[PDB]
Amino acid sequence: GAQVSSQKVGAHEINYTTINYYRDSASNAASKDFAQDPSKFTEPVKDMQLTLGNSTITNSVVAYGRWPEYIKDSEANPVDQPTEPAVAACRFYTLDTVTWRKESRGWWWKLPDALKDMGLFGQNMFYHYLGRAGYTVHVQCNASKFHQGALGVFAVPEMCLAGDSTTHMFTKYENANPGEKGGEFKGSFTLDTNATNPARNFCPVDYLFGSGVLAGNAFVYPHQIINLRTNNCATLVLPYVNSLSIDSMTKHNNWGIAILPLAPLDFATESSTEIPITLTIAPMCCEFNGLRNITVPRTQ
Amino acid sequence: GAQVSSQKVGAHEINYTTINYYRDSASNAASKDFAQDPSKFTEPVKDMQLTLGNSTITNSVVAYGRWPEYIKDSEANPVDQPTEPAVAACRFYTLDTVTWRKESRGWWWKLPDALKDMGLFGQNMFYHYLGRAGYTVHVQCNASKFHQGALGVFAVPEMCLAGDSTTHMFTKYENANPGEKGGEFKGSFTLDTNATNPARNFCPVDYLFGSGVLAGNAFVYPHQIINLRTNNCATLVLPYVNSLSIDSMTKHNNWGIAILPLAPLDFATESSTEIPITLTIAPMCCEFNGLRNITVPRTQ
Amino acid sequence: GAQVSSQKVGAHEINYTTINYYRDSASNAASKDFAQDPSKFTEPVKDMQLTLGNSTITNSVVAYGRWPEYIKDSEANPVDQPTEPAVAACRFYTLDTVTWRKESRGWWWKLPDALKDMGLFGQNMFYHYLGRAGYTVHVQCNASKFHQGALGVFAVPEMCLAGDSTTHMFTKYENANPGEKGGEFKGSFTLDTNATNPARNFCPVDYLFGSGVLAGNAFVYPHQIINLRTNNCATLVLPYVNSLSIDSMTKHNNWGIAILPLAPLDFATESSTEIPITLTIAPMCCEFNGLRNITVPRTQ
Amino acid sequence: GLPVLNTPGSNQYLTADNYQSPCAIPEFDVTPPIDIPGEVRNMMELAEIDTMIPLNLTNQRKNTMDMYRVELNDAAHSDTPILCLSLSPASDPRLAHTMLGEILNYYTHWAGSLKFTFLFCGSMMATGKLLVSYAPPGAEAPKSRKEAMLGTHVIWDIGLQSSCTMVVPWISNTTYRLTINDSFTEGGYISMFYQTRVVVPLSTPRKMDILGFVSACNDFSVRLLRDTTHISQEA
Amino acid sequence: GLPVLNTPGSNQYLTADNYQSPCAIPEFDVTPPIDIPGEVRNMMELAEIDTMIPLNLTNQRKNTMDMYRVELNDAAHSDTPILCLSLSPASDPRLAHTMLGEILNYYTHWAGSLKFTFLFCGSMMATGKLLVSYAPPGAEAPKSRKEAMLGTHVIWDIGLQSSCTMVVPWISNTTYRLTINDSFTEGGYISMFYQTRVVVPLSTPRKMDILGFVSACNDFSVRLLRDTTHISQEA
Amino acid sequence: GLPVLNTPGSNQYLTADNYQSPCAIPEFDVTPPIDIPGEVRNMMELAEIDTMIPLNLTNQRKNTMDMYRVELNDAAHSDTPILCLSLSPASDPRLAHTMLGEILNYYTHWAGSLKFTFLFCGSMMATGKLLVSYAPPGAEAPKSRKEAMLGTHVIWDIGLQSSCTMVVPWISNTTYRLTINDSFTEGGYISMFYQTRVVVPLSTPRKMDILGFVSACNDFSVRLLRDTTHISQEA
Amino acid sequence: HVIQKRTRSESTVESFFARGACVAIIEVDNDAPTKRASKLFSIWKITYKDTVQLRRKLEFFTYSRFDMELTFVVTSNYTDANNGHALNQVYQIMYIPPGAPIPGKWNDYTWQTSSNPSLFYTYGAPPARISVPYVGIANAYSHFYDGFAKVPLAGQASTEGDSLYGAASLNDFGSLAVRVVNDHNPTKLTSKIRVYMKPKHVRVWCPRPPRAVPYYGPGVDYKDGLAPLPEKGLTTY
Amino acid sequence: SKLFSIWKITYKDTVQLRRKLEFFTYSRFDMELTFVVTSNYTDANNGHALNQVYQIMYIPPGAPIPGKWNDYTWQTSSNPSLFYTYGAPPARISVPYVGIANAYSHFYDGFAKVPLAGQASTEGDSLYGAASLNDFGSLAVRVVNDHNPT
């Protein structure tokens, strides 16, 4: 059972044979213009009015070109019946509005963490052992034609943020899951030296994107730019991304949302100018498994 | 996929098998009268009046039997549109006439260096990043039937000339690119010992052909002999020769022209006799790429 | 391309495979009654009057059963036209007659050395760089029915004779090429101790056959016996034998003739009895190449 | 047994070899894969993603967000450059640490066209025309618009388009350029100039920022994988 | 595993071996070749190119251009040789450093015919007849025209032809000659003589130069590649 | 790679092995052979050539020509042997150094018939009858004609034939005999006797010589190649 | 008439270069790093111009294109009798392509060789061997380059725009870093790695006359042996 | 101490194979060469040594002959060279028939030179039976390792 493959000859003066000797395939040797070869990695658009449940919204990227979907029967690990709340949980929830000033270094949120106290979605999340959902994130920021500024919105799978102490991986659960308030990036790294009552919080540096990588490369993640001269809003459609078909929503945050001011806010000649940014997130294709008594995580 | 090849048996008392085990072909083992077997290496002739552009000339070798040609689309590295001046640049330019005496040790020139200040060809050469051209070199030397002497004209690809100092490869750009005046071979090697203001010039010894090789073997290069008793002139048709399909004409000289007196000039009984040698070079199949502001190399 | 050969089984309780791995066949492994199996090595006879040129002669062996022949075009090393004198050189020449006594230890000659001064054959031999010829050697020795004695005539290819000094291979050209007089074997080895004027001659011991081999085995060479009670003469037909198709006749002697008394000469009751032995040699299928001025080797 | 002969190279360990080895965990029931979004097949797929260029690497801007912003204003027209770059995507400090530069610093040879994009982040009431020029190497690097205009160039109407894209086509003597600073394979020069000036009305910011992105085109390739200089391990 | 037996020669390194080895740079995308003029397939192709013979290796001419020129004049006829050469293309000092000699000094055996060409570089008003002789070895080397004329020879009318070509045909006892000085495989002798004398009219140079070239014919072959003695490295 | 297991015998060097090895001179153009007369394919071809027997190895004859001659005379008839030999073609001193003996001394086993020839070198006027006898071993070696006549024998009329040939047929207990002196594989005895006497007329030599030759027949074979004792190298 | 059955098989450009020529002798030591006279790692700029024989053979032609087979013969010895003995050594040969970090210590991070091809050789094993394809950035290797890497422009000072004549990045193939992986024994050991280079699958263009005087540097310069030819009479056979 | 050795290739340094070959006048064959390498300490003190590597370079007639154990000739750019590691199985290589004639001459009844009339007794002299038919070059052998203290 010999495999006769062809070689690619370079310097000329053409087939090579390979035979597998082991039953386990892990023992085998390795076999080896503007158009984007990886069209799915260049933030493909949905190519209006988005209605989910009883919520309606009137610049849309699909992360990795993959729309949210339910678990295939071929890839279902759990065996118990899945709860699908449907319109009850799959609807747009509006988080607390943040304020963009000339001095803002950026904001961040975690999903599903930011929606843990959002109507029936939070109830289903805390009542079940396993949960899964994609998202539609709508960032809203409007300003006059005389305002200038640009925001970069990034959806990062496994958005791990650096700590603030010499102790590695020391950020406690409460500070890593702030909820809908989220957190803010910082312009510099400040080390927490309070060995008695350590803050045990993140210290996400903006130009390091909070994880030791240059912010300029954050555009490799699914992203959208809100340039105030052009558009008001940004829509990101995030499919469920994980190494598992379904996981624990309380333990693990599948996505992170980062908003960084790429161009600082400015207006006329008023040094005092602030415009709100409003996030509206709708979970999509929710499904839960493992119903039992409700989880009540520790707070503060 | 075994390869069964035949052996050539010598001492008799007949096939050997070979199999390639690696995907990369570089891993493979090696597979192994007057008529000239290498007809192209014995200076083949063009087998009158040569007209190029608006220039006409009334003993012609084609170097390596390869006529000048334009780049094939199959072998084009640059992607921008190529400039082909045509008759504007492809025409015969006459360099400064040199004087052949009884004491001359020879002359040398570099191409395209010798034509850098020749009409529109020089302008195109200095305006573009990449340039390519073959040549027709016409050496002219006429004398009476009572003169005796022989000149060897050699076209050398990559004609690198030895320096004049203990420092290796120390000849500066200005001395390596003299232009249409060219340079002269010497009868002996003189070491430049001026450590304060080194000449940084070549010291081409004639019998060493200026590169540490015996001059007698220079006939392996494309060549033509002007024997005063037989012919007046010599025509050499040089194709573009390089490891690249197109290169920088300012950085790199593709050809070198060497004229050596094989038999010394002599006449009647006048020890004072001199005859001119005139070079007329026409670039052929010129093409240029990478237009930008003009290059102005440093001089003197 | 496997070779499946058969084994010859001995002790029984049958094919073996071999594959050549190298392109060069030198790398291969080895593949492996009165009637004489080597009929050609047992001195085959010509199974009268022999006429060659203008010479006629009225017990004939063909050495190795191979008649003299001209060079095949398939095996011709030299490229210039071959001179074939024909009847001019191919004829019987009679050397000086020697005397067989009761005390003779034997005689030897070299071919073509013995015929170097024989008419036009010698002229052709010394005028050409290369020469080739077979021979017909006719040894003649007649005696009454009351004489008893036996001679062994041997034709030896590359008949190298031992020297007479402690210095190896010290026999000089003049002594190694005596001409038609030849030389005589000796009954004992005498060392030349004249370090001032060494003889630089052979010392061929008869029972050692002059080359360190027992004379009894000399019958492996082409040979013929002249037994006085039976026959008068012996004819040996020698083809050209050499590692080359043609060689230098002045440098190299292709054959040697040795005549040894196998049974000593005797007659009636006369202790003083001598009978002549006459050699008549005809070169055959002569061909010469490389004509130039005549060679004149040093003598005495 | 079978007669064999050990050729040179036997018992060596080449870290780039490709051989079979026994399995330490035979008959392991491997977890099947799932359809995870975002699969990468080639590193040039990542090299083709636009990432922001740290153009403004001044003393006070480097290692901050401000290094990504180039300031335009409404001053009177001038021929002085707005920014100047060298086409050394792996060794130029402003391009080395971009995603393209990071990928290139793992390889020794690169070839293909490049795609530069510039985003204007002023007010909608701002207007202006700029010139983005690429000059192939060999001549003096362009010092004014008069020289940069002689090379390849695009004219960008910021009032009309917020983004401009210029392709730097592959033009090289060699078939590949080295990923280091090398004179013989230098890539040329890139510059930006005011074509007209930037014009704003009253009550409008007179100073605004532009951002730069660089990516590879689909004809881009690299060769000779090598260790990068962008990461090191002390002790 | 498969039973194997290590034959003698295992673990040796033969510099002339031909074996496969792993690739240190797998999956390298090689630059394709282009049609460069002047491709060589065999070294005998270079050995067949005429190159000038340094015939005049006297004390004051050797290691100068003058070593390539042999002086003829219009003196009265004589039978003395103009030049004398030995057919030892690899070991004869006048032939060793020609291209043919350089190639031969990389091999141990050579065979085939040779081609000598002589170019006359006098005035067109000069006339004369010469004799170029090759004598196969074995006899005394020719000392006058009377002897050289008995071997192979050509008569050259310089007034008619500026160039003369003589082929020295392959005539040898052995099938190959050694590339060293060896009596048993000596190649013979070559010489030039005045057939008539050189005649010039008045107002003409009475002394002129001839040049010599040697090449191999198409029946020429070499064997047993070996290191040359023409290059050495001190320390 | 392929799993292999090194069997015993690996890395040994057997001087009688038969293995492939790399060529130190690849692509060598070998000189083709020519049809040289006298090609040998087997050593038994040489063993089948008659060579003279040193029969008379007395003190004063050994290591001279006289050792090859046996003297007959015209004395009155007697039953005493003329010569006596042992059928030990490799170890008998009178047969060991013949070509047959030389070839046999390179092998350990021999078998097949032998051919003895005797040449009479007297005058043509001499007459006589002889008896050549071979006696297989086991009994007392024949001391007179009365005993030798009981074994195999031929009668030779020297007046009629100058040469006589006797075949000693292969008769042995074992299928092969050792090439040394061994009692268990002894070959028997050979002798010559006067049947009548030798008669010469007056004026004729009364003493004459006979010569002996020994060769192998075509049914002769040898086995187990071995080093010979007939050649040695001091230091 | 003669049947001319002689072939030119051994004079093909493939057979001409079908040999392993030594181009480098790299010396390394296994010793305590406190010792300052011992070199614990060695860097060799890959080239064929450290030796003359293969260089002269290659410079018969102007351009070449071939794969390269590298063989490594490693020898070692004790530098002292006392101070005990040593166990079998392992050698790391890391290929550093131009741009990759160059080790500064014998044990720094660069030896991780996560991306650089590395060859680990055990002393006493048969000589190591690897193959490389044609890796030139041009379409052929340039044995000669009649030009400069820089063109000095008018106006810039004499210090700027200066480059060596005939030097280009066409021959920049990186280097080889060699070290002994073992920790030092109480006795100092000295090792030499000999690098043998064989061109295979060879093509050549533009034949040139061979070098006639001693090589002087990486260029075509000559200084000393400028009288290669001996004395021989014009009419002396 | 002799750091390198040169051996003129021949079969006449020993007698057994020579005697077997000289049963015949002419021969034609390929040749298999096997190399058995042995080594020993010449002293007990002065420490020990590491495994040795041997270079065997074939020098065909005409190729430069090494004069030092470490001169340029050992580059072996063109000469076939065999590198052997001590303790490995005996090295082995094959050679085709490499005679300049059509067969090997075990005997040559002649001279390489013919002395001509007139030239002095010193000239034209060559050994009897010696010809370049048996000139096969030599083998140069060295230890590649630098010297141990022993």
Ligand SMILES: CCCCCCCCCCCCC/C=C/[C@H](O)[C@H](N)CO
């Ligand atoms: C894996 C560690 C062992 C070392 C691996 C070596 C790989 C690098 C070697 C290739 C570079 C040389 C390629 C050939 C270049 C020649 O020297 C010249 N250019 C020939 O003209």
Ligand SMILES: CCCCCCCCCCCCC/C=C/[C@H](O)[C@H](N)CO
């Ligand atoms: C690669 C290095 C190892 C040594 C390589 C040896 C190659 C040279 C050996 C061939 C020369 C001998 C050829 C046979 C000649 C015989 O000794 C006699 N002529 C037999 O008659």
